[PDB]
Amino acid sequence: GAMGSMERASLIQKAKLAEQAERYEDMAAFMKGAVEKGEELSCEERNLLSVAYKNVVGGQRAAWRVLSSIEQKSNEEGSEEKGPEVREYREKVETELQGVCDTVLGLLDSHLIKEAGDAESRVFYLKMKGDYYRYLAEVATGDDKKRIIDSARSAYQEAMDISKKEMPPTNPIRLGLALNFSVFHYEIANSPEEAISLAKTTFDEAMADLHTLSEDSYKDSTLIMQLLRDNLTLWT
Amino acid sequence: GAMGSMERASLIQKAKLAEQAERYEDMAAFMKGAVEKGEELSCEERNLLSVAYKNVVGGQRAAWRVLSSIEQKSNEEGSEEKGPEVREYREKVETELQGVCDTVLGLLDSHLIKEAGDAESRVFYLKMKGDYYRYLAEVATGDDKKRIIDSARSAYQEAMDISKKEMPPTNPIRLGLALNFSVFHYEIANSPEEAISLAKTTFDEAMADLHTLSEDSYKDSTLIMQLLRDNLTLWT
Amino acid sequence: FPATV
Amino acid sequence: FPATV
Ligand SMILES: N=C(N)c1cc(-c2cccc(NC(=O)C3(Oc4ccc(Cl)cc4)CCC3)c2)cs1
Ligand SMILES: N=C(N)c1cc(-c2cccc(NC(=O)C3(Oc4ccc(Cl)cc4)CCC3)c2)cs1
């Protein structure tokens, strides 16, 4: 590891600086270095890790979608099949995306998840595992597409089972997990009814628990609840 | 699967024909199709599968070694760094090799090993799993090299434990497993002493059991025993 | 595209 | 190279 000689605390501090500078590839490399020190991560640290890689892979996904759209248009009957360049460059971006996903999944498997005993850490990491298999599923076309989809589903399902036993319905990790698992159902699993049912049940159960929250927790929970409603408005 | 419409028995017959024609890529595709029918494989069928892929990957390994040797020579101080072509083409062959290994490992995991209850099938498949992780290890350089090596070791070790409980010391599967695990130790694990000890103990225990064998079984066992001796002569 | 977090 | 089977 290129970060192996840097102090854990220095890596975390530089991740925070990279975030302020909108240098998310650096942020992710710093947080990968911090994870590789082998100690469990605090709440703030888990969110630094997640924010870094979600921004990196988010940029790759956006680029891949542009390139895939160009590629599909270049293959419609009535175009001008220039040559291999669009496919080649889409594949390059795709391979880089798959490499980032594999890196994150490797950090979760070695060894974040197995050491995560508290619900807030374990559910957070299993949600991430579902998310990064979902990103792999978005680009998958070959013999392992069903298996990638089921790996996402299985991770999300374990996270949901823990969250329903261990967290209140307004817990923002529980809400964000359900938001993303609902998107998995709609966009990946071709299960729009399951996606709508999950988002609606999650929203209604959170609504009925809002009265227990402080003003600050209320703001956190209702933010994700609005995203659930936004998706339901898109889908219905 | 491109073979999904062909009868299992027709796939096996064509694998045998491809072997006679020295068309090992076809042989492997036919046997992959046969495995994907989902039924367990007979002894003959397991050997058809193994022979096909060992010849395919064997050709790739030989090509990769030539290209890697050229690449290393082109990087020595005092050459003529033409450009990226040798590295690019070595990487192309390497990626194709890794894809074949992943295909075989996928067949073993989905679902040959889990349905293999008899020692002769289970040890055979676990030996194959060790072999194809070993081939991946031969080209591995990055963050997963140690993990690939340990996956080979673990598969070989489980196969050895079963073989020592369930098979006589002259059983050719047991012998071939030990031959290859010994090479794993020498060439992959940097454990030449373990490689020599395993080959010598395997040879001596087989020697002492030869008296129990028919003339045909004697010929089978002593053939692999000679390979053990050949390696020991190379290493000592 | 749908919202995720 | 060493023999394997
Ligand atoms: N960037 C950073 N330096 C840090 C961010 C946080 C942090 C702290 C509390 C809450 C959150 N919450 C979020 O950011 C959002 O809510 C989420 C809810 C659930 C999940 Cl699972 C993920 C996100 C995304 C939109 C609001 C962040 C610590 S440090
Ligand atoms: N080609 C084919 N149509 C088939 C070959 C076989 C078959 C039958 C009996 C023995 C063997 N034995 C081998 O071929 C060798 O011994 C091995 C011993 C152990 C292991 Cl694990 C693998 C090979 C490699 C050199 C001798 C093959 C059936 S069908």
Is residue A130 within 6 Å of ligand 1 at its C-beta?
no
Is residue A230 within 8 A of residue C3, CB to CB? The reply is yes
Cα B205 to Cα B183: distance, rounded to the nearest angstrom = 18
Token pair listed for A63:
């680029």
C3: amino acid identity, one letter: A
**Residue A202 to residue A225: CA distance in whole angstroms:** 8
Distance, in Å, from the CA atom of A115 to the CA atom of A8, rounded to the nearest integer, reads 18
Tokens matching residue A47: 């969110």
Closest ligand to Cα A12: 1
Q: How many CB pairs under 8 A join A and B?
A: 6
CA separation, residue A95 to residues A29, A67, A99, A136, A140 (Å)? 18, 13, 6, 10, 11
Q: Among candidates A102, A104, A114, which has minimal Cα distance to A40?
A: A114
CB B101 within 8 A of CB B132: yes
Resolution, given in Å to one decimal, reads 1.6
Give the closest residue to D5 by CA, choosing from B181, B229, B108: B181
Mutate to test the pocket of ligand 1, among A20, A47, A179 (most ligand atoms within 8 A of CB): A47
Residue type, B27: M
Q: From CA B154, how far away is CA B126, in angstroms rounded?
A: 9
A172 CA → ligand 1 middle, Å:
9
Return the DSSP state at B108: I
Looking at the CA of B156, name the nearest ligand: 2
Q: Do chains B and D touch (3 or more CB pairs under 8 A)?
A: yes
- Take atom 3 of ligand 2 and give the residue whose Cα is closest: B48
Q: Does A231 touch chain C (CB under 8 A)?
A: yes
Nearest to A220 by CA among A156, A178, A164, A174: A174
- What the block records as the tokens of B40 is 């367990």
Retrieve residue B148's tokens: 């690939």
For A36, which residue in chain B has the nearest alpha carbon?
Answer: B143
Breaks in chain B after (C-N > 2.5 angstroms): none
Looking at all shown ligands, the one closest to residue D4's CA atom is 2
Cα–Cα distance between A134 and A184 in angstroms, integer?
Answer: 7
φ/ψ region of A22 (left if φ > 0, alpha if ψ in -120 to 50, else beta) reads left
First CA to last CA distance, chain A: 48
The CA A213 to ligand 2 mean position distance, Å, reads 70
Rounded Cα distance between B88 and A175, Å, is 46
The ligand 1 atom nearest the CA atom of A43: 28
> Do B142 and B192 touch, CB atoms closer than 8 A?
no
Residue A188: how many other CB atoms lie within 10 Å: 20
Contacting residues of C for A51, CB less than 8 Å apart: none
Which one of 3.40.50.140, 3.30.300.100, 1.20.190.20, 1.10.510.10 gives the CATH number of domain A8-235?
1.20.190.20
Domain-by-domain residue ranges, chain A? 8-235
How far, in Å, from the CA of A47 to the mean position of ligand 1?
A: 6
Query: Could you tell which of B13, B31, B47 is best to mutate to test the pocket of ligand 2, judged by most ligand atoms within 8 Å of the CB?
Result: B47
Closest residue in D to B185 (Cα–Cα): D2
Query: Is B192 touching A (CB cutoff 8 A)?
Result: no
Whether C and A touch (3+ CB pairs < 8 Å), yes or no: yes
- CB-CB neighbors (< 8 A) of C2 in chain A: 183, 186-187, 230-231, 234-235
Count CB neighbours of A210 within 10 A: 14
Which of B107, B106, B101, B109 minimizes the C-alpha distance to B136? Answer: B101
Q: Which residues of C touch A181 (CB under 8 A)?
A: none
Residues 6+ apart with CB under 8 A from B180: B127, B130, B131, B134, B156, D4, D5
CB pairs < 8 Å spanning B and D: 21
